[PDB]
Amino acid sequence: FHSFSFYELKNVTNNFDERPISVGGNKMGEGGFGVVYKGYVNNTTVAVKKLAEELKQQFDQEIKVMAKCQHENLVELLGFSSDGDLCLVYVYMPNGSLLDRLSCLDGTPPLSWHMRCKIAQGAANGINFLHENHHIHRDIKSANILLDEAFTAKISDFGLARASTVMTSRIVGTTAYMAPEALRGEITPKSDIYSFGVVLLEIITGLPAVDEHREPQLLLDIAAAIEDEEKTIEDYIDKKMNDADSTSVEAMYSVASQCLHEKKNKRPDIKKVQQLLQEMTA
Numbered sequence: 572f573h574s575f576s577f578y579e580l581k582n583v584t585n586n587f588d589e590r591p592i593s594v595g596g597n598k599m600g601e602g603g604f605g606v607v608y609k610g611y612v613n614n615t616t617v618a619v620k621k622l623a624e625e626l627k628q629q630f631d632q633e634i635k636v637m638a639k640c641q642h643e644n645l646v647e648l649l650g651f652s653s654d655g656d657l658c659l660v661y662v663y664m665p666n667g668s669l670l671d672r673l674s675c676l677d678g679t680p681p682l683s684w685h686m687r688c689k690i691a692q693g694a695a696n697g698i699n700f701l702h703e704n705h706h707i708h709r710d711i712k713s714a715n716i717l718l719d720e721a722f723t724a725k726i727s728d729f730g731l732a733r734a735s736t737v738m739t740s741r742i743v744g745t746t747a748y749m750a751p752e753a754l755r756g757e758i759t760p761k762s763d764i765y766s767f768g769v770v771l772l773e774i775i776t777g778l779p780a781v782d783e784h785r786e787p788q789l790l791l792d793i794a795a796a797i798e799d800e801e802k803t804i805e806d807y808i809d810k811k812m813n814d815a816d817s818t819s820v821e822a823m824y825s826v827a828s829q830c831l832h833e834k835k836n837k838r839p840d841i842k843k844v845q846q847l848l849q850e851m852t853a
């Protein structure tokens with residue numbers, strides 16, 4: 572929408588105070604080749620991404636997409652800055668990232684099963700909208716699903732997004748969430764479905780996708796051993812909730828497992844996911 576100057580964004584972000592908001596600085600998180608700061612423009616609380624070449628691509632990209640695609644489950648951009656490193660201004664997300672809330676970072680209460688089931692549908696409804704509008708996110712992860720005052724899931728980061736069985740030399744995304752074909756250079760909506768299946772797994776277990784100090788390191792692998800009756804979801808169900816139902820949790824593991832078929836073509840499409848996630852909350 573608007574075109575803020577470096578200096579205003581600078582002045583209302585205490586000169587991009589890299590100290591964390593917890594200490595009473597402005598730094599909220601680090602993502603999309605940049606650092607996200609708390610701002611206060613237009614008498615409203617916002618989020619200001621200062622961008623760390625190809626950089627101008629990921630900037631002007633995140634504008635094009637964000638200008639075409641608005642939806643209840645996608646973050647909204649308010650404006651930007653070119654005047655002296657680039658900046659993007661977004662609507663504040665008071666409950667930050669699903670990752671940070673899943674790990675109860677900074678002491679936030681654990682998310683219920685109920686809140687978890689609505690966050691899953693939200694995230695689906697945001698991807699689907701992306702997929703209906705011939706868009707591939709390429710970076711569906713926990714850290715890219717933000718949470719509002721209502722704990723409504725909002726997908727962020729389209730500075731990697733691409734419009735739509737194609738191949739790319741610039742392989743990019745997050746290893747611990749990426750599909751095999753995406754890992755070898757395939758650009759296919761079917762990759763976004765797999766990543767999402769990792770997110771379903773994080774929602775169910777509360778485990779990060781990678782933990783270098785866990786056996787095994789990768790959540791993907793916990794799902795494989797379960798598919799091989801070497802483990803149970805039941806054993807991994809996050810203990811930090813009191814409302815979880817076995818039927819309901821098993822219904823969501825079901826969607827995940829299908830999302831994580833290593834055969835791109837055996838993966839459900841976003842609508843099947845949307846539908847499956849609905850039928851579970853019935």
Ligand SMILES: Cn1c(CCC(C)(C)O)nc2cc(C(C)(C)O)c(NC(=O)c3cccc(C(F)(F)F)n3)cc21
Pocket residue numbers: 599600601602607617618620646647661662663664665666667668671677679717727728
């Ligand atoms: C209020 N807040 C708390 C503190 C959490 C509480 C207050 C619950 O402890 N951590 C937060 C973490 C985030 C991150 C940056 C990791 O996403 C954000 N984000 C945003 O506000 C935001 C909004 C739109 C778009 C974007 C962007 F990601 F840049 F695309 N970010 C707010 C947060």
